[PDB]
Design a protein around this ligand. Structure first.
Ligand SMILES: O=C(CCCC[C@@H]1SC[C@@H]2NC(=O)N[C@@H]21)Nc1ccc([N+](=O)[O-])cc1
Ligand SMILES: O=C(CCCC[C@@H]1SC[C@@H]2NC(=O)N[C@@H]21)Nc1ccc([N+](=O)[O-])cc1
Ligand SMILES: O=C(CCCC[C@@H]1SC[C@@H]2NC(=O)N[C@@H]21)Nc1ccc([N+](=O)[O-])cc1
Ligand SMILES: O=C(CCCC[C@@H]1SC[C@@H]2NC(=O)N[C@@H]21)Nc1ccc([N+](=O)[O-])cc1
Lengths: 120, 124, 120, 124
């Protein structure tokens, strides 16, 4: 819809996603050869957003295991899509690593990514 | 990573029913606590991912999932993601932090996202 | 030092701070007449940062009560100062409102502010 | 807002000793859990703010504070802020979420900040 396609964040990463008609998000995420760096993503979005000019709520997850590498971690992005001539997906994210119990307190990093339709 | 499929309950009275696929998929349903309302009216689709080959040094299993708060009955114009780890054994837990983003106008975007933490156990 | 002075974020807010020699931060925060909008801030920073080009860790708190208004809430900013010709204070923040027990789950909002030495 | 001054303990074995001033100041010390180390080597200055006139409808008292992890003995080149609310009565609590930012190079800034939650009680 407005979401399906390729998106680029400030870090050099690339997000390719299909938004299904009833709320599914499926795709690949490439962190900053390209194929070693590509990971599955899945998520959900609001397939009927409000009609008052509000953004479209959405989230997705990447677990950082593919056929080549396993970082033993997962990131979730939570945010909203904003359409128009300067379309954005504005997110906050949580990256949790698998840890022992003694290290669990420091298992989760937090940050923010802004995605645009063109590269920075 | 073994150990995730099944029913989980958090401190808020929510129920999380998930299947963990062999290659890292999470699929299932998430139900909010109800008192007056019938259960299925507050049941929502979830999807996510988990580490299907965790380190076998006693570390937890990294995972995450998303609920968009739209179903056939209700739409809150919002989405939550949970990020955390599964810890196995006799008192198994899924320990998470979450981000809840509401769809807002640009002027309200700064206040769009709530943060919290949910601890899931196998008993209510 | 590099921190003391006036800082401006993307939202229209103004942060005026003094960094004391041993780690104190004291000042006023003005959210976007000016005086009704001004609140006390206090915090801490690393008064001896690493010498490898790293930023300077710091945090502060504003409780949103002044002589005129009380929102029954408090924000903390956590971040790092980065000096040089384009100096920044890059932060993530948590805004917690006072709530009943039943509403506590939704008490805390999270976001990010980037502060510069000139207005946006 | 009354009720905050004194000693508080979290689930990680840390000790938080704070004075709440009449107009909203928080001042005190924060000590990490120790096993081999002497207590004062892991004790740090804190400052913060709280709502000194909370709503008297059973709501909690909003507050926050900061520790920069430098003392006369050690420097971790980091700072934590806790944001939360004091809840009074017989099982009094300070329920918080926290952000821990490490000083990093620009290339490492994306991974500079950890997030978590601490529950403080009046007993260990
Ligand atoms: O666990 C990992 C996997 C890679 C995560 C990439 C993050 S997802 C949030 C942000 N947005 C992006 O587009 N990319 C970044 N990496 C990792 C974790 C910790 C450390 N470490 O040194 O501590 C090094 C690499
Ligand atoms: O947008 C919503 C949808 C419901 C979210 C439930 C949250 S997901 C994190 C946490 N864990 C759970 O199991 N349940 C809670 N609800 C909502 C949002 C805002 C307000 N509000 O008053 O602002 C009221 C309800
Ligand atoms: O409790 C409040 C007090 C004002 C907080 C301003 C925030 S601090 C993080 C960010 N950085 C800034 O420079 N300014 C913003 N406001 C408030 C809270 C909730 C609602 N609400 O409608 O839900 C309205 C106002
Ligand atoms: O930077 C530090 C300083 C110590 C922070 C203690 C945290 S504050 C939140 C939580 N609540 C507590 O009472 N204690 C913990 N430590 C540190 C940072 C990174 C790593 N690391 O391995 O990456 C190890 C130690």
């Amino acid at each position: 819809a407005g979401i399906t396609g390729t998106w680029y964040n400030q870090l050099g990463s690339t997000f390719i996603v299909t938004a299904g008609a009833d709320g599914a998000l499926t795709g690949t995420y490439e962190s900053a050869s390209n194929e070693i760096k590509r990971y599955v993503l899945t998520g959900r979005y609001d397939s009927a957003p409000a009609t008052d000019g509000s953004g479209t709520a959405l989230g997705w997850t990447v677990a950082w295991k593919n056929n080549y590498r396993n970082a033993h971690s997962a990131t979730t992005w939570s945010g909203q899509y904003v359409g128009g001539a300067e379309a954005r997906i504005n997110t906050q994210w949580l990256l949790t690593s698998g840890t022992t119990e003694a290290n669990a307190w420091k298992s989760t990093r937090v940050g923010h990514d802004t995605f645009t339709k063109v590269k920075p």
